[PDB]
Design a protein around this ligand. Structure first.
Ligand code: ICS
Ligand code: CLF
Ligand code: CLF
Ligand SMILES: [Fe+3]
Lengths: 478, 522, 522, 477
């Protein structure tokens, strides 16, 4: 647990790699130091994955269709390319919504052009135009179409932008072409950015000349909450109890009209900085809308965020902010009273995507737990700047961790609990280490807000103290 | 709000009044949602025959497919070999998806690597990715074999796997004797079952093509079994069990049963069991090779017959009573071993269950989908049970396959109202279960959404889903089940009759309305 | 009326308007029925704590018992012996009921004879009935053994079974050497499980009491296994499989799994398999005797210890993880055989499934009932799964048993809200699931009527039944299941988690209302 | 097989019995002879079963509690004795009813005194009185109580009659003591008669002296239809379409109120002669109500019955009778046109209780099938008189058939279908002989009436022609 022990744990693990991979991975592994606050003197990130080392990363299509565009509930998103990508991502992400699926909402459906070799040879542009017509006949209540490009599209010289402009004009329909081919970038991250640029270019400005929306002083947008298990609903509840008017949610349970109304708000509340800082910056420079980062993981961060947000408005909002804080005080205190004793002192290792590896730390600490290791698949150095502030001294940090690295780190550190993804869950269960999914919430949640904290606490307790963990060694082996 | 001693997850938390009012305020204020009467109007339209006709005129758009892409099958094939690492040459997003897809079905670790080809490799090829990838993979994860397939980006730009691997060995990245079979597995051709075929033939050729001269057919007195794309652990286990029971020497070529069911004993085992390299090398010395799923093993058959010189028997998938009978009798003929008393008894117990359950199964109407061999075996068994396979869908089926299923249907009175669909998807099937309502669906977890749609029309219109197939994501441990042989027929029959009885109990549970027929004994 | 191509059975035929009108007229015309408001009021009252209190004050009245009478158990025990005919001395009506009861659970023939005692015999005893009955039975049905028990009339009148059988042999009605073990089985003592104990002890006595002089403990290097009252075929089979896997020599004493599962191959087999007379004769030479269900093998235990000199181990029923572990370690110690790798792996697969499914099982609340050994094993496994067995009911349980279960509950935090009831019936249980509602019931088919009652209060209040126990009459072929060992724990775990997930799907299937939580992946 | 083979069959199978059982069983096996209409001259019945021969018969408690009393839906029926009888018979018979179970109806519940040895030693009359009170506290909407005695009650000297009188007077309640102990009689049959006399003595004379119910000339009662799978509802509909007023149903879906009004009707329509001819005779003697036998199995018998019943009334009913026949004609003709080709020529053997072995022959013949053998568990000679008129020449007749006999007869005659009970079903299915339960209707039905004939035909076809029967032989045997 001492710095020197972590550093030689790092060196011993990298002894297995060939020369080239050794030197690269050394750059992506660090021990946190309060003397170093810049990250750009400490860890490298957002680089290509070394081949053959079993990265956990996905692709830019995941970051665009899976993450940003897919949740928009009243549009139809075409997975343009062969059949795989759209199928493996069908309904895997629990970006919750209210709608009548197949009629006016389409989130858990898989629309695809199902590329055949003929489409590789001749191109898919003509097929895409026919497909758009077929979507219009069979799904008349769709409010827009997006075209999520899979690997072959760019590779064969297809021009989905022209198709989108031609058919969009013919049908008076918003049709967004997104060049999120999976070979682009190094990870899901570039998919976020491409997706953000597609919103800006083809959707966000549609109402620049309109003035019929009735604004108020308290209009906000939730930016970068994809409503995993209802996360954004359990956040919105608090903001509106505080007197704000949440005009839009990007993009969990989000409608295209919400997107279009966002340039009319007074303040953009950015939860997931990694995936939506791009559009937040755009809206600041163009429409003059300020943005701010917040955190609704656990009562400490939620209280701090509510006050910081209210401080951007007037006395009346600040007073209601304290009314909300006072209302939920007995509730989250009852949660800590029951669950913190059952969790305090336990050590947690996390590995997630671009936000949660830091954003959930305060929630674990609200339950007496300690995060002794964390890392991201695809974060940038500004994420790691924020992570050093949240993570403890001499803790382990890993960027684009390999399957082998994560396994070897766990064996040595022996954390009481691991929080990571589905490709990781079953490895560490077999090792006898309690595991919680920190993408899908293991089909539970919400975890955001005061109501989500109660679920979060309940969930870590039920797994960490489960009777099953005592049973892995047979009584006759010993 | 939350009450500490009765915490609510999303369901039913968001049914609280304050959440309900918040959500209504979000819809009315900012969603510009179509009025409910209009949603109701369009929904009813999507249940119509006129909608079905528009639906079946689709040519470019696919909605809710019932198939995946080739590398998924190549991965499952590769996992069936001892200490073998599946290795997909191309872009890494694919491998994240394949692993997660199988992770969710098996609830097990699934090991597979990419060589992370990006924009750079998309113009100058992924030779360097292969060299570093193979060397990195062998050193970090210590496989005895690396089985290589391709994503669609590597196929489009035309990477020559054979040359790339050969150059990796020439230039010292991997030992020359280290085995690295390969197969091209383009996602825009066929489906996931095609990738399994391609991968298996690639492995078979790697170990046998250049060593045939010493081989003698039948010298090892064994029968080769090639299972194909198989996602029920019970199906690997039942085949081995029956052949062991017959005293038939056999080699199961691609056997992932152990790696997909490792114990939770405090240690992670990346590899377990599997077909050995010796078994593949020796496989041409077998008496014959049996293909358990011949309709997606066409390339394998050509190699087995053209190079090993085996006369692959014409056998349907061993599903149901007749085709298990035929499987056992042909193995008996090949091996010279008589069908033992134990299997004869097991057959008669299945027939017994059939006679016990026949009054509840008779005339029951089913829509069903899956891979070609699985579907036609399910059709066959349903006909043997006196059931009517009304809607038969195989998205990845072909004309020759549909012709064979239509011939099976024609031979039975219970096929009179059945139609076989190939190339159609689950949005097509949705229409069919509204316009020509069956009693149940047999299929994978994607069917859950069709059941949801039918209930929205009305409880009397709901078609319940019976989960048999791949993938099953919303129930736990059904991947442990069996569908082949008498054992799997027993399991399927039990699932069907009790799904029927569960539904009847629900429809007769209403006191003083329908519970006159809520019988204790059925 | 009927449409010829869509014929209606009772459901939904009688929902036709003309049948509805006819039934309404019958009610209003001639039934003097209470107003519907009065029915609703009284129903609601029956769901309240005030009614529960009156309910639990019952002393004389039993309503919806969860037990049967002794001869049913004696018949089942007798059926487990080779070519043995169970024979119930007394009134014939009982035998018609015992046979039909088992017919409906196993869906198999059940052979048993009566000697048809009538009012005449209640005057002059049933000796002539025994003499003619034994002769007629032996000649007509050709058993190699007849195992005699009694109905309650024969017990009240006081027939001396021992003397009657002796005189039947003395007078020449049956050969002296022909085995005719016997046991008194009064229905007004204990329950069906007591009948099993009495019958088994009688058969053990018949074949060993007089021949102990030549006996030497351990001389045959086997372990005796006494299963008790057991109605899952897989429970006989799993014990034999495990013991064979370990290389342990064993004698399963009372083994009905063959005669209760004969194949449908064109002939009826009255007898099949079973413990041989010789296995019982030789049983005192075993190393030891293991009682799989000790809480209803008390009399057997005292005989095996007092006469055979075996030191019967203190083992719970081998259900769940801990108690299967304990069974195997004790068997390993007695026999000198180590626990093999195959069973150790099987253990770790069960644990793996526990880890995979723990988040949906945790905290789930259950009401449950059955026989003592079964119930305590299920309570034990539920605690291992993180479940809360809130209402634990054993109608035929006793003080000492309830204390042992209360001890097991106190050793776990998942037992803090549980209560164990003995001597209470299913009408008591109905009150408990209204006043202290659990998530599910685990029980036999009589539970379906409690689920019906709960639904009638409201869907919110419905408590779904999960069918594990005896008898199961309204589902098919669940008697083939397994509840013992790791195999059985696997099956129970799968049934419980998927029952949970099936119900969650039902509650979230509402389009635009609750289907936000209708997840594809769970 | 024609006559001389059947007689040889009978002697051959009885070769295995000991001499005493053989001489007895010889008298319960006969071959129909159109030139002898009197059964007392060719078969004996309603005698004791031979011990140890695996009879299919039940006991008098089955006949009383299981058949007659249990279906009465708004009374609480007490199985008075140890726990078995009430449990094995809980909801095993599909005597359907409309009610709210546990509130105002109680058919599928098992109420019992659960005798312990202390009740054998001291008697159970005190327990029974405490039990009645407990029933009254927890089931206040019950309209009466019956006490169905199990074997021990009479043997130990209990006096449930006095308890019923004392508690009945105390609580102003109908409490019916029934001495249907299973050691009484030889079968379910005596249970029927005991139950009939209990209705008469304790229920039926209560509105003799009440006349305010509004009678019509078309009032009838259905006597002896226990509404198996809804059978009596599918009969009632036709009688009322024909213009009659079915005042009571004995006892399927029956209320105590209906039974008490039956002395006010103008005609008793007896379906099950065996089980309720007794009370029918009593009601003709004391109230002057005529009774007549009828048969609602299959179109031919149903049509004959409607006409015969209608002839007891005026022209207006006889006109409506013809309207009902014309209405249902196209329906049952379509059933025949679909199913008779699929079943014609197939030979059926039956073995059931006390009515259906003869009552269903006409329906089988309406589908072209031939009943080549039949028999009863507990029929009397007057039942066999009726049977020989409906059975074909040289067909096999058996009374209280043994399991061994039934097996051997089937092996030789090789019927295409067997109809019998749950204790027989799985035997013959394993021999590859299609089997339909003819007590429970195999959880189908109704079979009575025109609506029932369609279900009956569908059921015979689905089983006889099922694919499972051609697969019992392994292709390698
Ligand atoms: S968008 Fe991102 S990997 Fe910010 S791509 Fe990923 S629903 Fe993760 S750490 Mo899955 S940057 Fe959201 C995420 Fe975080 S899909 Fe979810 S859990 S907060
Ligand atoms: S990096 Fe891979 S392909 Fe590329 S955009 Fe990302 S998921 Fe997709 Fe869909 S079709 Fe199949 S999965 Fe593999 S090969 Fe192509
Ligand atoms: S002829 Fe007699 S009335 Fe008839 S069914 Fe037998 S006892 Fe009962 Fe057996 S089943 Fe047991 S031993 Fe008594 S109690 Fe209930
Ligand atoms: Fe697992």
């Amino acid at each position: 647990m001492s710095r020197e022990e972590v550093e030689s744990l790092i060196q011993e693990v990298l002894e297995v790699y060939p020369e080239k991979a050794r030197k690269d991975r050394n750059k992506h592994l660090a021990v946190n130091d309060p003397a170093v606050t810049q990250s750009k003197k400490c860890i490298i990130s957002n680089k290509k994955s070394q081949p053959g080392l079993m990265t956990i990363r996905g692709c830019a299509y995941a970051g665009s269709k899976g993450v940003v565009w897919g949740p928009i509930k009243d549009m139809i998103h075409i997975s343009h390319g062969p059949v795989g990508c759209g199928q493996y991502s069908r309904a895997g992400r629990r970006n919750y919504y209210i709608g009548t699926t197949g009629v006016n909402a389409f989130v858990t459906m898989n629309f695809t052009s199902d590329f055949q070799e003929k489409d590789i040879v001749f191109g898919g542009d003509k097929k895409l135009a026919k497909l758009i017509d077929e979507v219009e006949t069979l799904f008349p209540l769709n409010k827009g179409i997006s075209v999520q490009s899979e690997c072959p599209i760019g590779l064969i010289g297809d021009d989905i932008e022209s198709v989108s402009k031609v058919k969009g004009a013919e049908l008076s329909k918003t049709i967004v072409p997104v060049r999120c081919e999976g070979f682009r970038g190094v990870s899901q991250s570039l998919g976020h950015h491409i997706a953000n640029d597609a919103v800006r270019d083809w959707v966000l400005g549609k109402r620049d000349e309109d003035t019929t929306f009735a604004s108020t002083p308290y209009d906000v947008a939730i930016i970068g909450d994809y409503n995993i298990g209802g996360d954004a609903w359990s956040s919105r509840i608090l903001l509106e109890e505080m007197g704000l008017r949440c005009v839009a949610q990007w993009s969990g349970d989000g409608s295209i009209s919400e997107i279009e109304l966002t340039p009319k708000v007074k303040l953009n509340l950015v939860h997931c900085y990694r995936s939506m800082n791009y559009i937040s910056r755009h809206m600041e420079e163009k429409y003059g809308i300020p943005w701010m980062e917040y955190n609704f993981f656990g009562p400490t961060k939620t209280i701090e965020s509510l006050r910081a947000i209210a401080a951007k408005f007037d006395e009346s909002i600040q007073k209601k902010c304290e009314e909300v804080i006072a209302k939920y005080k007995p509730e989250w205190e009852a949660v800590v009273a029951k669950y913190r004793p059952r969790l305090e002192g336990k050590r947690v290792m996390l590995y997630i995507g671009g936000l949660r590896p830091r954003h959930v730390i305060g929630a674990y600490e609200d339950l007496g737990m300690e995060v002794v290791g964390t890392g991201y698949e695809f974060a940038h150095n500004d994420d790691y700047d924020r992570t050093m502030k949240e993570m403890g001294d001499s803790t382990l940090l890993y960027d684009d961790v390999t399957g082998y690295e994560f396994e070897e780190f766990v064996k040595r550190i022996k954390p009481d609990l691991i929080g990571s993804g589905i490709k990781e869950k079953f490895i560490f269960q077999k090792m006898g280490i309690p595991f919680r999914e920190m993408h899908s919430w293991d089909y539970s949640g919400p975890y955001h807000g005061f109501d989500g904290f109660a679920i979060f606490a309940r969930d870590m307790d039920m797994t960490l103290n489960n009777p099953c963990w005592k049973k892995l060694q047979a009584p006759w082996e010993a | 709000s939350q009450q500490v001693d009765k915490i609510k997850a999303s369901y039913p938390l968001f049914l609280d009044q304050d959440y309900k009012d918040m959500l209504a305020k979000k819809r009315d204020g900012f969603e510009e949602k179509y009025p409910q009467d209009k949603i109701d109007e369009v929904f009813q339209w999507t249940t119509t025959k006129e909608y079905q006709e528009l639906n079946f005129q689709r040519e470019a758009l696919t909605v809710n497919p019932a198939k995946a892409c080739q590398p998924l099958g190549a991965v499952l094939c590769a996992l069936g070999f001892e200490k073998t690492m599946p290795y997909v040459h191309g872009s890494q997003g694919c491998v994240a998806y394949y692993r997660s897809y199988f992770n969710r079905h098996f609830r097990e670790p699934v090991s597979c690597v990419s060589d992370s080809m990006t924009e750079d490799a998309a113009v100058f090829g992924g030779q360097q990715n292969m060299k570093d990838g193979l060397q990195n993979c062998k050193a970090t994860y210590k496989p005895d074999m690396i089985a290589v397939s391709t994503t669609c980006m590597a196929e489009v730009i035309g990477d020559d796997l054979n040359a790339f691997i050969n150059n990796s060995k020439k230039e010292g990245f991997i030992p020359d004797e280290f085995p690295v079979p390969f197969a091209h597995t383009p996602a825009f051709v066929g489906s996931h079952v095609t990738g399994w075929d391609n991968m298996f033939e690639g492995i078979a050729r790697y170990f046998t093509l250049k060593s045939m001269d010493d081989k003698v057919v039948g010298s090892n007195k064994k029968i080769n079994i090639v299972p194909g794309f198989e996602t029920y652990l019970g199906n690997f286990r039942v085949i081995k069990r029956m052949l062991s029971e017959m005293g038939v020497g056999y080699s199961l070529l691609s056997d992932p049963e152990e790696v997909l069911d490792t114990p939770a004993d405090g240690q992670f085992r990346m590899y377990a069991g599997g077909t050995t390299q010796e078994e593949m090398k020796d496989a041409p010395n077998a008496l014959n090779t049996v293909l358990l799923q011949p309709w997606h093993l066409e390339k394998t058959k050509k190699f087995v017959e053209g190079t090993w010189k085996h006369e692959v028997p014409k056998l349907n998938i061993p599903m149901g009573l007749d085709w298990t009978d035929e499987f056992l009798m042909k193995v008996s003929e090949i091996s010279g071993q008589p069908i033992p008393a134990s299997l004869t008894k097991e057959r008669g117990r299945l027939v017994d269950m059939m006679t016990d359950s026949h009054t509840w199964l008779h005339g029951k109407r089913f829509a069903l989908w899956g891979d070609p061999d699985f579907v036609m075996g399910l059709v066959k068994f349903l006909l043997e049970l006196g059931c009517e396979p009304v809607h038969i869908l195989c998205h990845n089926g072909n004309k020759r396959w549909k012709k064979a299923v239509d011939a099976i249907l024609a031979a039975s009175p219970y096929g009179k109202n059945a139609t076989v669909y190939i190339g159609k998807d689950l949005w097509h099937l949705r229409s069919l279960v509204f316009t020509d309502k069956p009693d149940f669906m047999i299929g994978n977890s994607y069917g859950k959404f069709i059941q949801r749609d039918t209930l929205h029309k009305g409880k009397e219109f709901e078609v319940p889903l019976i989960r048999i197939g791949f993938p099953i994501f919303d129930r736990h441990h059904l991947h442990r089940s069996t569908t082949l042989g008498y054992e799997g027929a027993m399991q399927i029959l039990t699932t069907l009759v009790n799904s029927i009885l569960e539904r009847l109990d629900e429809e007769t549970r209403g006191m003083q309305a329908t519970d006159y027929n809520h019988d204790l004994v059925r």
